[PDB]
Every structure is written in structure tokens, then in C-alpha cells.
Amino acid sequence: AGGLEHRQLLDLAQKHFSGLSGTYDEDAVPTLSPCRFTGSQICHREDGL
Amino acid sequence: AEPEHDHRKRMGLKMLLMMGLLLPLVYAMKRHKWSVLKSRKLAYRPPK
Numbered sequence A: 001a002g003g004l005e006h007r008q009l010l011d012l013a014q015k016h017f018s019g020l021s022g023t024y025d026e027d028a029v030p031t032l033s034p035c036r037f038t039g040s041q042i043c044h045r046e047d048g049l
Numbered sequence B: 001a002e003p004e005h006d007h008r009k010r011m012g013l014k015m016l017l018m019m020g021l022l023l024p025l026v027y028a029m030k031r032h033k034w035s036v037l038k039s040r041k042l043a044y045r046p047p048k
């Protein structure tokens, strides 16, 4: 973001990022599992504060 | 000597049935609220 043409950013991308692995592993693609929310409570009692 | 005999026995039956309902339900309400405390876990981490 700033004073720059989108063209030059794409050129620099193909110039300095083409050397990057775009081929994932056979079955090692990470997938985010949903995270269980839990109604709960945590109380760190510290009266010195 | 006890004209209320028959009516009292009918009431006694209704009292036992309602108590057989209300006692476990009210017991369940007690444990429901108290479960917050009965499963609470404590840990002590003093500075050393």
C-alpha cells in the first residue's frame, strides 16, 4: 500500500517469489479443525496485586 | 372415631406420588447448581 503501481509489485513477485513451493504434500495439507467453546471460569486469586 | 379415614388414605396416595416426582427433580436442581463447585479444580502456584 502506498505510491506504487500494481504492475511492478507483480513483477517483483514473479521475480523473487517464483522460487517457492506451490505443490503441497500428498496428504499433509493442514486443515483447521473447529474449536469447541466451553462455558467455564478461571480465577487466579492474587490479593498482592 | 375417624370419619376422615378414607379421604386421608386417598390424599396419602397422592402425597407419595407427588413426592416421588418432586424429590428427584428438586434433588436434580440442587446438584445442577452445585455441579459448578463439585467439579471445580484447584491449583497452588506460589512464587519461588
Ligand SMILES: CCCCCCCCCCCCCCCC(=O)OC[C@H](COP(=O)(O)OCCN)OC(=O)CCCCCCCCCCCCCCC
Pocket: B010, B011, B014, B015, B016, B018, B019, B022
Ligand atoms: C393461606 C394458606 C396457608 C397455607 C400454609 C401451608 C403451609 C405449608 C404446608 C405444606 C403442606 C404440604 C402439601 C399438603 C398436600 C395436601 O394435603 O393436599 C392433598 C391433595 C389432594 O387433595 P384431594 O384428594 O382433596 O383432591 C384435591 C382436589 N382436586 O394432593 C396432595 O397431596 C398434593 C401434595 C403433593 C405432595 C406434597 C408436595 C409438597 C410441596 C410443597 C408446597 C407447599 C406450598 C406452601 C404453601 C404455603
